């Protein structure tokens, strides 16, 4: 017979690294908003692989894009040209109104690329002496697990024990314009990198006007505004970019995770020529960056986001979701926050009770979510969810919370 | 009409970053050893996307693995389990005889993972004080384009202008056991990372006994031996790992690039428990790392390497290839080097003449290669090439070199 859930757990424990402690559920199929485990049980996906499957699992248009391109060509390396890359580049740059895109594979690779662009621009355009350029980050940031990315983290689990750290990364509080204004007095600062809503930190939504203020301060002090929209972009918050809510144009925009609908690791760095062209041929790249297969998949995923109006659905259904979540009692759920379909609730963590046990019971009742701190539970279903499906899942959430 | 080659070049120039200057050829299909451009012209691929398509372009078994898995499930994130990952992990760990694998996406991500493992092991097992751990690298190394990876590079084009650098990375000459012995006198050294043959540096093959000496010195001084086999592994040099030529077992083995046959970005970090389990749950990861689609593709690519005996083919045909290349005159080709099907020739670069013009003419004559320094031309066709195909390509190379 084929392996049970427990066989799957045990096998991973024996042969795989222990860098994760996942929710004990062994999934097998995903379609749209749904996931099935090896026993056949059906669940709503309320994690969406951290927004990588905004389009729902195995969206048939993106699946067909993958299938059509793999029968053909998948990787030439950028030592030669392929056809697909230029088409995808024109598409995405015109969609987001930037001169150019630099293609990479994973989100952290886009972050690293942004850091390199900011430093190169700082030395060659702003005139900072090599190698005094600084980049400012917001406490609570998460942008990956490289040595550089954990060097900007304030989370000890990300950086503790991981050797000496990248210099030139400063940290200020999130949602704090006076602190940014103070940091940007140093002319050696080249950039400020920030998430428009902090995902991994617990869906931390900054105050209205924060993004506008960030843009104003960055412009005033000749500092690049890098917006990490790898989790908040591509309709998840109800707009193409979360920064669109304040009509703010960052200098560099990072995209990832739903850029492919979960079918391929595709990431993008968007900016104008006076920043992008600071990097000359041979000075940056990636083996799989810009390969034809991922490019086809990304064109298809962006087209799915546009043609199915998923940002508007995210907006309206997130309004419904937060309104319903706020009816849970204050004695158990101390906070409800989010934008569009990126939301979270905060648990009145006792020790009779916590976010992990809540997610276990939610799995028991047919809905999959995972906590991000122990009192924070993220709710982020695929943007293809319909209102009746959302209301049934909300019913599951109510049943689970009021089970305790 | 559909875009010509020149349209493709111009479009990428307008909408894409200028981080590459590729060989002017616009490819469209790849199958096995062959590539076709948009005009219909046919070429031998003698770059193999830097060994990512060891199995040849669009190998039907790996294509079918991709197609079968994408109709199903592609990404749950590691917040939950999927079935495929444990199966792939058991497979690859038993294949290479290590306790465990840590899955990532790109080669540089495997390198970063290795660095984190080495530091965490240095502090928690070797007892180095935080954060004094050092990692030693070999001059000429290339392992990616993150800030940490360019911090260990001796190539100014990789690091110049890219902000202050990661501390704790020391550099010694390649192919130099006395220099390694000298570096390892510092008890704060946690690891030595090295390529068994330096690919990007120009297929630099170290002297016989170098890998044995590295292993002996690392063991003697309680230092981890990290072997980057992302380009040299998976049959390319004629063995499963290039280190197999000296029956050397590194502490950490990095795999990438052919791990997927070019169909998906899949990388792996292999090592035993006493190293791997220094990283605890929540302390490292990746969104796409270990996803089911890439895992299916990787199982298939490894199976193709094993069942088609591609390491033996690489061995014998590389013998033939180097023997034939050495018949070109000394006045034009000053050196021929390599192992298995990873080879290179060195050009007597005049200014009447150089490696770029040679590769242009080779493209004109139906074979695609790219220089790596201006007198170095890499020859690395897919390991599915047959002897008559190889001899025809050698004929192309002769025709081209003796055209000048
Ligand atoms: C990716 N998001 C994160 C990775 C996940 C995990 O595996 O635990 C959960 C988490 F929120 C991310 C990145 C990095 O992208 P990748 O390297 O993982 O592809 C960068 N910035 C942001 C905002 C996010 O969400
Ligand atoms: C990958 N090899 C390199 C990338 C290529 C390019 O785009 O120019 C050519 C070059 F040789 C590599 C890596 C990094 O893997 P990725 O991040 O690119 O996936 C690490 N180590 C080695 C030995 C190699 O070859």
Curated annotation (Swiss-Prot), chains A, B:
Modified residues (N6-(pyridoxal phosphate)lysine): 257
Listed cofactors: pyridoxal 5'-phosphate
Effect of residue 20 to H: In HOGA; decreased protein abundance
Pathway: Amino-acid biosynthesis; L-proline biosynthesis; L-glutamate 5-semialdehyde from L-ornithine: step 1/1
Pfam families: Aminotran_3 (PF00202)
Mutagenesis / variant outcome for changing residue 318 to D: In HOGA; decreased protein abundance
Listed result of changing residue 119 to L: In HOGA; no effect on protein abundance; loss of ornithine aminotransferase activity
Stored CDD domains: OAT_like
Effect of residue 382 to L: In HOGA; loss of protein stability; loss of ornithine aminotransferase activity
Chief location category: mitochondrion
Protein location: Mitochondrion matrix
Residues found modified as N6-succinyllysine: 67, 72, 327, 370
Protein family per UniProt: Belongs to the class-III pyridoxal-phosphate-dependent aminotransferase family.
Entry function: Catalyzes the reversible interconversion of L-ornithine and 2-oxoglutarate to L-glutamate semialdehyde and L-glutamate.
Pathological association: Hyperornithinemia with gyrate atrophy of choroid and retina: A disorder clinically characterized by a triad of progressive chorioretinal degeneration, early cataract formation, and type II muscle fiber atrophy. Characteristic chorioretinal atrophy with progressive constriction of the visual fields leads to blindness at the latest during the sixth decade of life. Patients generally have normal intelligence.
Name of the featured protein: Ornithine aminotransferase, mitochondrial
Organism of derivation: Homo sapiens
């Amino acid at each position: 017979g084929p392996p049970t859930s427990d066989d799957i757990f045990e096998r991973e424990y024996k042969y795989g690294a222990h860098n994760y402690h996942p929710l004990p559920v062994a999934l097998e199929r995903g379609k749209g908003i749904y996931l099935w485990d090896v026993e056949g049980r059906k669940y709503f996906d309320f994690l969406s692989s951290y927004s990588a499957v905004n389009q729902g699992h195995c969206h048939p248009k993106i699946v067909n894009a993958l299938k059509s391109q793999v029968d053909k060509l998948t990787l030439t390396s950028r030592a030669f040209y392929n056809n697909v890359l230029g088409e995808y580049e024109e598409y995405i740059t015109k969609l987001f109104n930037y001169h150019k895109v630099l293609p990479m594979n994973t989100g952290v690779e886009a972050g690293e690329t942004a850091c390199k662009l900011a430093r190169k621009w700082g030395y060659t355009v702003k005139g900072i002496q090599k190698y005094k350029a600084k980049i400012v980050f917001a406490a609570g940031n998460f942008w990956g697990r490289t040595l550089s990315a954990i060097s900007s983290s304030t989370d000890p689990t990300s950086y503790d024990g991981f050797g000496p750290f990248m210099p030139g990364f400063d940290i200020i509080p999130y949602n704090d314009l006076p602190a940014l204004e103070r940091a940007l007095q140093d002319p050696n600062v080249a950039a400020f990198m920030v998430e428009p809503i902090q995902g991994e930190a617990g869906v931390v939504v900054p105050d209205p006007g924060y993004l506008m203020g960030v843009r104003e301060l960055c412009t005033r002090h000749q500092v690049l505004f890098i917006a990490d929209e790898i989790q908040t972009g591509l309709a998840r918050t109800g707009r193409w970019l979360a920064v669109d809510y304040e009509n703010v144009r960052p200098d560099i925009v990072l995209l990832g995770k739903a850029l492919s609908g979960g079918l391929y690791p595709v990431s993008a760095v968007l900016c104008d020529d006076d920043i992008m062209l600071t990097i000359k041929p041979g000075e940056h790249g990636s083996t799989y960056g810009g390969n034809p297969l991922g490019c086809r998949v990304a064109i298809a995923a962006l087209e799915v986001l546009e043609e199915e109006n998923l940002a508007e659905n995210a907006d309206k259904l997130g309004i419904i979701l937060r309104n319903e979540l706020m009816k849970l009692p204050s004695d158990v759920v101390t906070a409800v926050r989010g934008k569009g379909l990126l939301n979270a609730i905060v648990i009145k963590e006792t020790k009779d009770w916590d976010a992990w046990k809540v997610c276990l019971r939610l799995r028991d009742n047919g809905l999959l979510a995972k906590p991000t701190h122990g009192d924070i539970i993220r709710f982020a279903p695929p943007l293809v969810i319909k209102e009746d499906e959302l209301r049934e899942s909300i019913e599951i959430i109510n049943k689970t919370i009021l089970s305790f």
